[PDB]
Subunit: 295 residues, 4 copies
């Protein structure tokens, strides 16, 4: 009920000097809801969580909750490779009034499966909010196995879902076995959200939704209805965009696309770049025209 459909991994707009642009962020969230987004993820990876201060992280979560006004669930990014920091970020989001938590697998320090279990257990015990595990080997290197995931689901009632960015669709099937058919599985990959739902997924936490919220929402709606022929038609319309925004970092592809369609600021924080290669920008332009978002 809460975790379904098209859920944007919201960008964090900045002003020219790199400061958080609260006006632009609020306007983006308002527009997302109006266009049919089924949920919101503030201050995740695509919201540039790595370069935000604790105060900025807190404020954007609070602002997202305020703008949403209980219309759609707010699933706050509360990730860290430091368990104590993850708990600290999780507790704030609970106090601020978030509906759920998105918790990434620890990156860089490369814990064991038992370390992953201990990390997520400690977060789950510290809060009452529902938790969605964010398994992303392409970023974190480590990979939570279906066995570890199943163990966490059994041990903690508030571990309710996964944002699965493995890109291995057989993992959805394996997770159905280890975690149950009721376990909430959301795609962490825009380009395979289609196949992901065919395997049992019920939505996607999406980067592309930042650019094309209506099309992404209708795409997800088609799959919920069991209309996969229509879903494939949406894939035909959207795939060039999915591909183009990820030629370089998704944050930067997304902010470029929105700079063209909506006059959004391209500013990001280092080590991300406010610029893109010409072939990337050309592909994004062509993809926007193909999707009907530009002329």
């Amino acid at each position: 009920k809460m975790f379904k459909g098209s859920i944007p991994a919201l960008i964090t707009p900045f002003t020219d000097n790199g400061a958080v642009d609260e006006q632009a962020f609020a306007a983006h969230v308002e527009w997302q809801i109006a266009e049919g987004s089924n949920g919101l993820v503030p201050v995740g990876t695509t919201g540039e969580s790595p370069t935000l201060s604790h105060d900025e992280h807190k404020r954007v979560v609070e602002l997202c909750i305020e703008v949403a006004a209980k219309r759609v669930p707010v699933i706050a990014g509360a990730g860290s490779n430091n368990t104590d920091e993850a708990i600290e970020l999780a507790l704030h989001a609970q106090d601020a009034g978030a509906d759920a938590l998105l918790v990434v697998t620890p990156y860089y320090n490369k814990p064991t499966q038992k370390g992953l279990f201990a990390h997520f257990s400690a977060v789950a015990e510290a809060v009452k909010l529902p938790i969605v595990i964010y398994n992303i080997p392409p970023r974190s290197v480590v990979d939570m196995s279906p066995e570890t995931m199943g163990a966490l689901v059994k041990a903690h009632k508030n571990i309710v879902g996964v944002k699965d960015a493995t890109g291995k669709l057989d993992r959805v099937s394996e997770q159905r076995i280890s975690c149950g058919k009721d376990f909430i599985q959301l795609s962490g990959e825009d380009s395979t959200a289609l196949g992901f739902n065919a395997h049992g997924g019920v939505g996607c936490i999406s980067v592309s939704a930042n650019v094309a919220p209506r099309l992404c929402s209708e795409f997800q709606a088609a799959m919920l209805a069991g209309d996969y022929a229509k879903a494939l038609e949406y894939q035909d319309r959207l795939m060039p965009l999915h591909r183009a925004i990820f030629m370089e970092p998704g944050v930067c592809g997304t902010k470029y696309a929105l700079s063209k369609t909506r006059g959004c600021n391209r500013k990001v924080r280092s080590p991300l770049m406010s610029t893109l290669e010409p072939a990337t920008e050309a592909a994004i332009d062509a993809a926007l025209k193909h999707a009907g978002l530009m002329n």
Copy 2:
């Protein structure tokens, strides 16, 4: 023509390692009876690497004879040697095959231009439809959608792909580069479900050797657009898909068939006629789950 559940047929051997022609014929006949929509003789799962040229030719001919035009025969004609690939392609054409399955050259690691040259040479040599068999997990090299698109434009008889990348976004990229009419068949049993959601129209399948009826019904559900039913089949078949591939698929399959149909487990070295106890236990459990064993 080329659609649905298409078994990547095993080649049964007798105890001494010789091709068991009668066991092969019975296997093909049963496959057709159970609803398989096409046949791939002497591909990877048919142990093409360990068959002689004479054996390869004989098994292709037998498959054609047993099929009796009921379902298409898509003959394995792969090699990392272009000249050899052409020879196998020409034989299969002369024997009366309906199409050719042509693997990307393995081991020698050609460039994209080398892949283009290889497939162009095969396509120019025969009139039969060709299905490109792109399998980076075995061949290392990976035919890009751009190279694939160039081949499709250049040769009218390059009609499809058996896509074993396991990257479902590649189906979408191949729709763009090769067209929506390009025939895409899954080369991975466990993701055949998502593959068809992305535009695929079937699967060249190892699991179909063991469960041809369930695999055919699974594919039929997807053709009908009934993806809820397809997922129910996935629930039933996934343990088998996983278990068959814990060790090499040929060996997992021949073990499963030894339990259900009294098939010989014999394979040719470097494949092994044996499996680990845990693999056999997992296959046993999967067969029970699928309703193929009590």
Copy 3:
């Protein structure tokens, strides 16, 4: 002269409660110097930088400098995937009196090569200290190319070296071409420190040196002397240890080994675990006996 030989990537010992054990750290550093270590890296990955607060990071750097007493160079860990944070950490270490900085490639957020250039350029311009680039694709996923590295070396006089944890020894040869023969190359992999120096390396920033500082120092001394036959004898003695301490995370393998030889506390911070598998502990035990560090 500064950066050479056996340079331990120092562990940060904790008490049972998880607080920094300053006394144990001081004793560890003093022993390292006594046993022949040629330099020191405090608060790097193996020092559990991800789970240390800014204050703790600061204190341990300051502590390392004081105990060292200018006997060997202190190369302070100052890594982050946030450029602003990397600068802050680098500035403190400089203020504290560090001799150099070890700066990791940004992890998790996956910048482009141009993003890597921007990140390291920003750190280099902010400080006067020499900087060693820490290129570790197994942790950061991104991989600084020899071309990007060479561009940084040309642009900034204070970018002087690399801790190369690629495990691809041909990269040393490529880095000699792009960065010059005088560019300081230090192995980031204990098990291939031998081949690394044969290719032109001049030392190793080492996890194993925490456990066997004398053997590691003598090993490096043999290679400086050009005595590769002797260096291979040390490899025979040390390889089982190199392998065993990395069966599970190196921090945890190292702290177990030190618990056996020196009575070190095994405590680490989550998501790292204070425990190991029985097979790992048995392998470390066997390796210590083989090395002559236990009976």
Copy 4:
């Protein structure tokens, strides 16, 4: 003079070219060019010869051609250096046939690749190499190359083979993981013959205990490669690094595209050799690749 080793037993070391197989314009084996290449390799200081390995285009040769080139190599070598015949296949029966032919023809050893494409288990690898080793009396060098075969023979499997078969004597190790040399010393012994299967890391490979390299670059620069290996045998690693400085651009350039094609281009420039290869390899290269090879040849002193 002849090769003798004062263990009359059984010596494979130094710079050992993975010999190309020259073709005429029509793609037929050029026996004249092959013989001339072998003769020149020996004259320039190569310490052994591998005919019809991967770089000799074994995948595109017929059985007859494979046999002929092996025999020709043995004939031309005339016992001056060891001939380690390529006898690889992913079909065990075929590997045995090739092994037996090489023995009867007078080869000194076999180079036997891990089965590619069919992806056997570790136990399958053991069975494959055991069957080959039991069939012949020749020394066998295991060719472990995960970048081509995908499968990777573990040090444990390798050690088990060494224990089971006295004629399994060495490895051509193309893992590119130098810690594997150290692990193979543990599992197979310090006397196990380890030869680098990667030109660019032959330097570090010997530092870890290797005693030579089965080499693509040696086709182009046999004298420099032999002197490079001699420096390492003498323990002169500073000199070896000077050779690496001289040769690394060539190691890199010839592998920008397939090594067979990089090598045949280089030899077309230095010695007028034919660039012809058999499909799916291409007789052509990208302009930037050729330019890089040209620059590398000049740097090495092989072209003006």
